[PDB]
Amino acid sequence: MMKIAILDDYQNVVRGLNAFQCLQGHDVTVFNDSVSDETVLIERLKPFEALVLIRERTPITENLLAHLPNLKLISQTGKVSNHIDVPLCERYGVTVLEGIGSPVAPAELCWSLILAASRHLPSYIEQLHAGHWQQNGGLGLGRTLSGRTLGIWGLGKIGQRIAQFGHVFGMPILVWGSEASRQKALELGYQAAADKAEFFAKADVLSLHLRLNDATRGIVTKQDLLAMKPDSLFVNTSRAELVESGALYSVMQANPMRQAAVDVYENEPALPNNEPLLSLPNVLCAPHLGYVEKNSYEIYFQAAFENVVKFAHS
Amino acid sequence: MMKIAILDDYQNVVRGLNAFQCLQGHDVTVFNDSVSDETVLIERLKPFEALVLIRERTPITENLLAHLPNLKLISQTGKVSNHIDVPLCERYGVTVLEGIGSPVAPAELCWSLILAASRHLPSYIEQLHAGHWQQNGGLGLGRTLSGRTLGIWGLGKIGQRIAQFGHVFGMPILVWGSEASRQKALELGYQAAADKAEFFAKADVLSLHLRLNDATRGIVTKQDLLAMKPDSLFVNTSRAELVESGALYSVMQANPMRQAAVDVYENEPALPNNEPLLSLPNVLCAPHLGYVEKNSYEIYFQAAFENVVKFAHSA
Amino acid sequence: MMKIAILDDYQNVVRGLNAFQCLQGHDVTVFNDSVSDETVLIERLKPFEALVLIRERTPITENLLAHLPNLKLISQTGKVSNHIDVPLCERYGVTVLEGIGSPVAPAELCWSLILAASRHLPSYIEQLHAGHWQQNGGLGLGRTLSGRTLGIWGLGKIGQRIAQFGHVFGMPILVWGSEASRQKALELGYQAAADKAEFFAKADVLSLHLRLNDATRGIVTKQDLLAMKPDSLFVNTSRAELVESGALYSVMQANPMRQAAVDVYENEPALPNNEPLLSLPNVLCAPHLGYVEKNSYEIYFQAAFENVVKFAHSA
Amino acid sequence: MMKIAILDDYQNVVRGLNAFQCLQGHDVTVFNDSVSDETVLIERLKPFEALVLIRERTPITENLLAHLPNLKLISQTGKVSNHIDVPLCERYGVTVLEGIGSPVAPAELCWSLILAASRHLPSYIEQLHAGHWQQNGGLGLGRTLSGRTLGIWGLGKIGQRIAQFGHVFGMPILVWGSEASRQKALELGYQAAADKAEFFAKADVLSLHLRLNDATRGIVTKQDLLAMKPDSLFVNTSRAELVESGALYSVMQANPMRQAAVDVYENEPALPNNEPLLSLPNVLCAPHLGYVEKNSYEIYFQAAFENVVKFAH
């Protein structure tokens, strides 16, 4: 019925979902690489009548829209976000359909990074397979989250789940942000940090859960990072651009006593050749794996593909 | 006062513990390798009066005790276990003192393994450093714990904490084991399985939390493993000997859809090319990390070192 | 005498050929980078009176011809084709002379691709250097050619050599194409396919040996690829544009049990994150190597340089 | 009916063979790692009544048999070889059954390495994937086989197929070996080297197809390799021990313009940390992939698994 491109399925896993059967009858091409040039992208996507987007992996610009005359439908996995403007699409004769957000998989993934980093898990496992029992490349002993203070900035849906995890794991919860967020924190029985200085100085584990906008861009300074404890764990599963550019790498390089766990980067795909954080033994780097999960996918693509079907019948 | 040996400190971290202060004004040597060879051990330990053991890393045999006439004290970190024979030690004039363990670190470590394996975290990270974005060696998508049943065998010190974790992760909790474990599960509001078959049938993630003894040796058969869901996660942070010998390797090797996470092995240290579990991509292997943690070490060694000090003031 | 430019010698090997001595007493510059930016090309080629082209690596456009007034000669390695418009060149006062080329290196290279793809050779080798013995990234076992039907579209100078290769390797030979190709097939004792549908259905290994033109542009459709066996190997050492745009990538991505091997692409140089075929484990991608070979290059350039010196004396 | 271990299935591919169905109703365990340490191996293998061996990947030493009291059967894939002594096995009450082999996959693989090396194909592919168009790590232009002399040492089942490939690729065939091999060569219409020295001097591509024994151990010297053309290709898909120890590395290091293609090594698994040949740009290394192929495996394991079935009655 329609020519459909599915973009940025890096792992080639979309075809393996039960949800994929929803696209029976359509002429479907799944792309699995990452095009940096919009000129190249436009030529590639010219034939297609519908696009299925994977979250924010490809931004939909006016230049993109204006040069895809066959495009009738963009079907978005989850809610439309910063990477897509619906009114703009419609002016170009493109319907945008969307799904719903889900905080479950990202929250779980964030906790996994925190536990892994705190116990030096990747290093210990790699060394086990290298033939060195219970070594981790000189990182020393791992530590419990119990009795350690969990610092949380964004107190949204994901931020609240992480705070719940921390509490049940025996962590004092310290919150910083707007007064409204800190008030919510206090009502939930958590602590509110007196200021940004005290927040960064007191957190043993510090996790960011803020949406990126003009108020939040570079809101975490190098100065903030440098005020953290010498054995602190900094966690960013939200957006790398919340942090002053190159500030994370600089601080982590200077102090092998401290650690960080990240899921997001300034440029993605982030690879050893373009991302200096990947060269540091005290930084745990994950490949934007927050929403990349079996249930998350099935839910995302069930909605996205049904939307294609709904549109196909319209 | 006493010449004291500490065995098996692989990372050489004991000397740096706050607890090491308790041994002020004593002659202390901390060994940092893994020696199983008993004649090497006998030569190493001959001049010592006190031995500090790290959980079960070295066994104390009749051969060892009969050739160590200067040994007067074994100070065990945590409880005595299968690695030591207290009545036999006392027969050779050796006093055995024990400490108290903590379930906090092992519970957190077990959860770390469950989440890491569920999300194929080490594979993804490894592949990233090799230059491949969002690849994990062909293992496919990871899976969430939310709404999947956490089968727990044994609701003791560690198991009860694992249930709390599963609960907050939105997992139903299904408990098997002794009658006492099942009663406790219901009293806490969880589910209790009526029998072993139901427990092995329903569990999506199944985690063992049992003491190893003659009753529990091989209590988990190959039959029970094959009865599990074809996409289940099997978790053992207790003892390898709880499972029928060779049965976990057999199942996991033959069924790549299935997954396991282990922290323990039939022989430790477990080495590649030797431990077969280490060659299976569907089995996450950690080097017995459960109790290997800063606060846990401080607790173990604080009590173990104070026992040495207390024994040393005699008579 | 003449200022001479040689374009697109990526490995800078032309300088080292026996044929290069044929240019003694001329002013020769050999370029090694790939420049498609005509602005850079015009600025680079202004002072030159002759260009020596390496097959189709640079198109000669009116834009180039309009802005290169000192150019008198283009000497083509091999014959002219899609990249050059001889009537248009002469209209700008540019003589185009053509050389000669050999089918041997391309035939041998096509076979090398077929054998490498069949046995997963590059992945096995790469994994070996990465420290993984006898691994190939989860592609499983490779396959012998013996017994498998070799499908050849086009039985010309290259096609005929591929058939002789398949035959000695014990492959049935099935031929599709022009009547002349299929007549040759029967006269050599190979099979002629009844139609294109039978050809795609029955070939285990299918290799294209056609010239690209208005008749053969998009002659392989996506539907043709989809009619192939689920464990088949598709081979293109001819021109990517013979196959419906994007169809090969779409089909290979969808079917990881199928395989492909290509020497040629819609845009060359073909680059990662641009050419989608470069991101599939089941497609072997080579950088247009067919004609890139010692003996082949000696032939190309001896004839091309011969025409240069013939033009010098013409004048 | 019988506890069975299949050793050394590196890629874990045996279970997926159609031939595996021949073991329905048996207790089967497959190992995919590689254990050198016999004390470890002894412990691993104690419970098993039968072993299926994959060619020569594991040797059966006396120390091994002497400590495997439950072992009743060794079912060999293909024929017995250097790794196993049958009357020694019998002396310890162990039955050895051998299966049928196949020369098809090894000959094709040998040929694929010859072409791949001649054209620097794996290097060109790697470079293309890293974004470097038509580069190969500085190995230069490839060469065609047509008109180059193919030298073959050993004219058995594999050597003969290699000669047929060579002939069809337009290669003069020159054979060395015993008078038996050379008679066959001339009878097939090929040529025979007058002495060993002419063979190494004249061959453009030189390929070994010999069994390893007392006669053939180190039969190729450092001096023989040195006698070859500076643009020659040396090919060993038989056994590394046919060539003087460490000699191939020495010649290839010191002469970056010569090239070699190998499928076999002194110690297998051969890894970067134990095999110096792997660090040389002018040596194409494959992980003993001669007999590692679908049809070959189905043939090997069909036979080996039927020998288990037949024995268990």
SS (H, E, C) D4-52: EEECCCCCCCHHHCHHHHHHCCCEEEECCCCCCCHHHHHHHHCCCCEEE
Tell me how far apart the alpha carbons of residues D19 and D11 are, in angstroms, rounded to a whole number.
Answer: 16
Phi, psi (degrees; rounded to nearest 5) at B266: -65, -35
Six-digit token string for C3: 């200022």
Contact between C254 and A12 using a beta-carbon 8 Å cutoff: no
CA triplet D25, D26, D29: central angle to 5 degrees?
Answer: 140
Q: How far, rounded to the nearest angstrom, does the alpha carbon of residue A63 sit from its chain's CA centroid?
A: 26
Query: What is the DSSP secondary structure assignment for residue D102, as one 8-state letter?
Result: -
Mutation target to probe the C interface, by most C beta carbons within 10 A, among D14, D133, D158 is D133
3-class DSSP state of C187: helix
Query: What is the DSSP secondary structure assignment for residue A243, as one 8-state letter?
Result: B
Residue A236 vs residues A57, A161, A286, D6: alpha-carbon distances, Å: 18, 15, 11, 47
Contact between B274 and D34 using a beta-carbon 8 Å cutoff: no
Torsion over CA: D120, D125, D127, D131 (sign): positive
Write the CB contacts of A208 (distance below 8 Å, at least 6 apart in sequence): A153, A154, A220, A235, A236, A237, A238, A242, A243
Are the beta carbons of B107 and B158 closer than 8 angstroms?
Answer: yes
3-class DSSP state of D3: strand
| Residue C274, min C-alpha distance to chain A (Å) | 6
Phi, psi (degrees; rounded to nearest 5) at D299: -60, -55
Tell me how far apart the alpha carbons of residues C161 and B195 are, in angstroms, rounded to a whole number.
Answer: 70
Look at strands B205-208 and B191-192 and give their pairing.
unpaired
| Residue B264, min C-alpha distance to chain C (Å) | 25
Contact between D37 and B273 using a beta-carbon 8 Å cutoff: yes
Experimental method of this PDB entry: X-ray
Cβ burial of D79 (10 Å; 0-12, 13-18, 19+) is exposed
Contact between A33 and C272 using a beta-carbon 8 Å cutoff: yes
Write the CB contacts of A257 (distance below 8 Å, at least 6 apart in sequence): A230, A231, A282
Residue pairs between chains B and D whose CB atoms are closer than 8 Å: 29
Are the beta carbons of B244 and B222 closer than 8 angstroms?
Answer: yes
| Residues on chain A touching B13 (C-beta within 8 angstroms) | 140-141
Q: Residue B207 forms beta bridges with which residues?
A: B152, B235
Helices within C27-148 (DSSP H only): 38-45, 62-66, 86-91, 104-119, 121-129
CA triplet A247, A251, A256: central angle to 5 degrees?
Answer: 150
Question: Closest Cα to residue B200, out of B242, B172, B233?
Answer: B233
Question: Closest Cα to residue D222, out of D258, D192, D264?
Answer: D258
Residue D156 vs residues C128, D107, D184, D243: alpha-carbon distances, Å: 29, 11, 10, 19
Helices within A193-270 (DSSP H only): 196-202, 222-226, 247-254
Question: Closest Cα to residue D42, out of D5, D84, D79?
Answer: D5
Whether C246 has its CB under 8 Å from any CB of chain A: the answer is yes
CB C110: neighbour CB atoms within 10 A?
Answer: 27
Are the beta carbons of D134 and C292 closer than 8 angstroms?
Answer: yes
Six-digit token string for D134: 């038509």
* Chains in contact with D, counting 3 or more C-beta pairs less than 8 Å apart as contact: B, C
Query: What is the DSSP secondary structure assignment for residue D84, as one 8-state letter?
Result: B
| Residues on chain D touching C170 (C-beta within 8 angstroms) | 104
3-class DSSP state of B200: helix
Sheet of D283-285: strand order equals D191-192, D173-176, D150-153, D205-208, D233-236, D259-262, D283-285
Is the omega angle on the peptide bond into residue C315 within 30 degrees of 0, that is, cis? yes
* Chains in contact with C, counting 3 or more C-beta pairs less than 8 Å apart as contact: A, B, D
**At which residue do the structure tokens 């010196």 appear?**
C309
Residue C75 vs residues A304, B102, C27, C51, C86: alpha-carbon distances, Å: 56, 83, 15, 6, 11
Are the beta carbons of D162 and D110 closer than 8 angstroms?
Answer: yes
Give the per-residue SS3 of D220-233.
ECHHHHHCCCCCCE
Q: How far, rounded to the nearest angstrom, does the alpha carbon of residue C156 sit from its chain's CA centroid?
A: 15
Is the omega angle on the peptide bond into residue C47 within 30 degrees of 0, that is, cis? no
Are the beta carbons of A9 and A33 closer than 8 angstroms?
Answer: no
* Among the partner residues D109, D127, D143, nearest to C295 by beta-carbon distance: D143
Write the CB contacts of C9 (distance below 8 Å, at least 6 apart in sequence): C15, C30, C31, C32, C54
Torsion over CA: D108, D82, D185, D200 (sign): positive
Write the CB contacts of C16 (distance below 8 Å, at least 6 apart in sequence): none
Residue D60 vs residues B267, D65, D78, D264: alpha-carbon distances, Å: 25, 7, 15, 20
Six-digit token string for B215: 């009753």
User: What is the Cα gyration radius of chain A?
Assistant: 21
Question: Closest Cα to residue C100, out of C74, C75, C77?
Answer: C77
CB C83: neighbour CB atoms within 10 A?
Answer: 14
What single letter denotes the amino acid at residue A163?
A
Tell me how far apart the alpha carbons of residues D283 and D280 are, in angstroms, rounded to a whole number.
Answer: 6
Six-digit token string for B84: 């030591």
Helices within A84-236 (DSSP H only): 86-91, 104-118, 121-130, 157-168, 179-187, 196-202, 222-226
**At which residue do the structure tokens 């091989």 appear?**
B218
Tell me how far apart the alpha carbons of residues C79 and C81 are, in angstroms, rounded to a whole number.
Answer: 7
Contact between C141 and D34 using a beta-carbon 8 Å cutoff: no
Are the beta carbons of D110 and D161 closer than 8 angstroms?
Answer: no
| Residue D146, min C-alpha distance to chain C (Å) | 8
CA triplet D161, D166, D171: central angle to 5 degrees?
Answer: 155
Tell me how far apart the alpha carbons of residues B260 and B249 are, in angstroms, rounded to a whole number.
Answer: 10
Whether A299 has its CB under 8 Å from any CB of chain B: the answer is no
CB C81: neighbour CB atoms within 10 A?
Answer: 14
Helices within D72-192 (DSSP H only): 86-91, 104-119, 121-129, 157-168, 179-187
* Among the partner residues A28, A33, A47, nearest to C273 by beta-carbon distance: A33
Whether B138 has its CB under 8 Å from any CB of chain C: the answer is yes
Instruction: Name the closest residue on chain B to residue C132, using Cα atoms.
Output: B279
Question: Closest Cα to residue A9, out of B115, C276, C223?
Answer: C276
Whether A36 has its CB under 8 Å from any CB of chain B: the answer is no
Six-digit token string for B77: 């970190």
Phi, psi (degrees; rounded to nearest 5) at B284: -85, 125
Whether B133 has its CB under 8 Å from any CB of chain A: the answer is yes
**DSSP secondary structure string, D59-80?**
-B-HHHHTT-TT--EEEESSS-
Helix-strand-coil split of chain A, %, nearest 5 = 40, 15, 45
Query: What is the DSSP secondary structure assignment for residue A73, as one 8-state letter?
Result: E
Tell me how far apart the alpha carbons of residues B148 and B129 are, in angstroms, rounded to a whole number.
Answer: 31
Whether C237 has its CB under 8 Å from any CB of chain D: the answer is no
Tell me how far apart the alpha carbons of residues D180 and D185 are, in angstroms, rounded to a whole number.
Answer: 9
Give per-residue burial for A76-87: e unless 16+ CB within 10 Å, then b.
bbbebeeebbbe
Task: Give the H/E segment covering residue A45.
Answer: helix A38-45
Contact between B286 and A128 using a beta-carbon 8 Å cutoff: yes
Six-digit token string for B35: 């020696």
Cβ burial of B263 (10 Å; 0-12, 13-18, 19+) is buried
Whether D246 has its CB under 8 Å from any CB of chain B: the answer is no
Whether D254 has its CB under 8 Å from any CB of chain C: the answer is no
Write the CB contacts of B130 (distance below 8 Å, at least 6 apart in sequence): none
Write the CB contacts of A192 (distance below 8 Å, at least 6 apart in sequence): A174, A175, A176, A182, A183, A185, A186
CB A298: neighbour CB atoms within 10 A?
Answer: 15
Tell me how far apart the alpha carbons of residues C62 and C59 are, in angstroms, rounded to a whole number.
Answer: 10
Whether B272 has its CB under 8 Å from any CB of chain C: the answer is no
Q: Which domains does chain C have, with CATH numbers?
A: 1-102+294-315 (3.40.50.720), 103-293 (3.40.50.720)
Cβ burial of A168 (10 Å; 0-12, 13-18, 19+) is middle
Question: Closest Cα to residue D258, out of D291, D282, D278?
Answer: D282
What single letter denotes the amino acid at residue D82?
N
**At which residue do the structure tokens 């990233």 appear?**
B128
What single letter denotes the amino acid at residue A73?
L
Instruction: Name the closest residue on chain C to residue B132, using Cα atoms.
Output: C279
Look at strands D50-53 and D73-76 and give their pairing.
parallel
Cβ burial of B93 (10 Å; 0-12, 13-18, 19+) is exposed
Tell me how far apart the alpha carbons of residues C283 and C258 are, in angstroms, rounded to a whole number.
Answer: 9
Resolution of the experimental model, in Å, one decimal: 2.1
Helices within B25-103 (DSSP H only): 38-45, 62-65, 86-91
Contact between C105 and D141 using a beta-carbon 8 Å cutoff: no
Q: Residue D75 forms beta bridges with which residues?
A: D52, D97
Tell me how far apart the alpha carbons of residues A93 and D75 are, in angstroms, rounded to a whole number.
Answer: 70
Mutation target to probe the C interface, by most C beta carbons within 10 A, among A33, A37, A271 is A33
